[PDB]
């Protein structure tokens, strides 16, 4: 009957732990203001907010280029898995020279 980690509810665990994310959000907001100000908005923004252009345009090129290349390398069109079976176990069980190929 909800013994451990769950003796107080769902909206109670969420409120205690909400204060651990504070440094990371501030640091990310500092980072995302010289490259693309609209990439990481705050939690108190609405239709009327205006995003201003930084004085230099070197961050955007670098970020877009790296994001493109990383995905080109990580996820190709051909499969990126193998699903292999152990060797020497076909050998101790097979009786013909055309078993590994069929598997």
């Amino acid at each position: 009957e909800r013994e451990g980690f769950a003796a107080e509810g769902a909206k109670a665990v969420y409120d205690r732990l909400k204060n651990g994310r504070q440094p990371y959000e501030t640091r990310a907001q500092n980072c995302a203001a010289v490259t693309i100000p609209s990439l990481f908005p705050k939690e108190s923004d609405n239709s009327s907010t205006e995003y201003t252009t930084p004085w230099q345009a070197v961050g955007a090129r670098c970020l877009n280029n790296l994001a493109a290349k990383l995905m080109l390398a990580l996820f190709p069109q051909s499969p990126w898995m193998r699903l292999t079976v152990s060797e020497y176990e076909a050998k101790t069980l097979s009786q013909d020279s055309e078993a590994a190929a069929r598997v």
Partner: protein
Amino acid sequence: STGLEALGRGQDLEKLTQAVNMMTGLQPLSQDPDINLPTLKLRLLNALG
């Protein structure tokens, strides 16, 4: 949509072309009495997917 769509048929076409090119070069070895051609072709086709 476009995941593998514009190259949806091109992916098949490239694989088929490579298979034909590989099977073309095994004709000189058709008079060698120490080679198992049927299994070699199967192992050559399984290495492309």
